[PDB]
Design an enzyme around this catalytic site. Structure first.
Site, mmCIF file in Angstrom:
data_model
loop_
_atom_site.group_PDB
_atom_site.id
_atom_site.type_symbol
_atom_site.label_atom_id
_atom_site.label_comp_id
_atom_site.label_asym_id
_atom_site.label_seq_id
_atom_site.Cartn_x
_atom_site.Cartn_y
_atom_site.Cartn_z
ATOM 1 N N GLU A 135 69.727 27.289 56.419
ATOM 2 C CA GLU A 135 69.644 28.693 56.677
ATOM 3 C C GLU A 135 70.123 28.959 54.797
ATOM 4 O OE1 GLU A 135 68.671 31.261 59.058
ATOM 5 O OE2 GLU A 135 67.984 31.384 56.889
ATOM 6 N N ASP B 249 69.765 26.291 62.106
ATOM 7 C CA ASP B 249 70.430 27.197 60.657
ATOM 8 C C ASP B 249 71.844 26.401 60.110
ATOM 9 O OD1 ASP B 249 70.353 29.690 60.217
ATOM 10 O OD2 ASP B 249 71.474 29.566 63.092
ATOM 11 N N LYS C 55 68.464 32.771 73.045
ATOM 12 C CA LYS C 55 67.676 32.280 71.930
ATOM 13 C C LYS C 55 67.452 30.684 72.281
ATOM 14 C CE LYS C 55 68.706 33.130 67.101
ATOM 15 N NZ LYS C 55 67.484 33.185 66.985
HETATM 16 MN MN LIG Z 1 69.816 32.143 63.091
HETATM 17 MN MN LIG Z 2 68.156 30.185 60.831
#
Ligand SMILES: [Mn+2]
Ligand SMILES: [Mn+2]
Length: 177
Positions: free
Chosen positions: A61, A89, A115
């Site tokens: 990320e 991430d 998610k």
């Molecule tokens: Mn995330």
């Molecule tokens: Mn992400």
């Protein structure tokens, strides 16, 4: 808006710059989508704190898509770990697994289900944080030590309380952006 002022006062300039870049990618304006602005800054800061609390973690990320996929590809080529569909991430070198970090203003189990249903990869670890000190992780494996997670929870709660002190929390939590 007061939300933009709060974002520039509570978040370091590098995080604000990356968030603005992500909004340009979205074609969104930080002065209009202020709650999304705060959420992106918060998620970036959490990812950076998570990675710094280890080098155990590779940050994905915050990179542009080219470099993010370059890093993911190099990791997959060296370790043989399955390539994820969506950009995760973090990568955990100790457990050798990708990590998807979530920050939600709703209940942690609802966001976890969202998610997990999106990523559709049992290999990618999920870790969800709330603004109330709650967390939920795949197989209840929280990866980090209790001190680091407490630091993240304190930061999130403090952001919530600063927003509430500025009368911004209700709009932010009622928004899912
Ligand atoms: Mn995330
Ligand atoms: Mn992400």
């Amino acid at each position: 808006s007061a939300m933009e002022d709060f974002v520039r006062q509570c978040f370091n300039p590098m995080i604000v710059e990356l968030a603005e870049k992500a909004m340009k990618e979205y074609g969104e304006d930080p002065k209009i989508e202020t709650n999304k602005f705060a959420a992106i800054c918060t998620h970036l800061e959490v990812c950076f704190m998570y990675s710094d609390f280890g080098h155990r973690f590779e940050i994905i990320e915050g990179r542009d898509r080219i470099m993010a996929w370059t890093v993911v590809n190099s990791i997959c080529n060296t370790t043989g770990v399955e390539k994820p569909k969506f950009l995760p991430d973090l990568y955990d070198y100790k457990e050798n697994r990708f990590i998807e970090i979530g920050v939600t203003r709703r209940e942690v189990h609802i966001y976890y289900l969202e998610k997990a249903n999106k990523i559709k990869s049992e290999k990618t670890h999920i870790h969800i944080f709330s603004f109330t000190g709650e967390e939920m992780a795949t197989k209840a494996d929280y990866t980090l030590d209790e001190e680091s997670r407490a630091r993240i929870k304190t930061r999130l709660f403090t952001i919530r309380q600063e927003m509430a002190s500025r009368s911004l929390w209700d709009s932010f939590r009622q928004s899912e952006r």
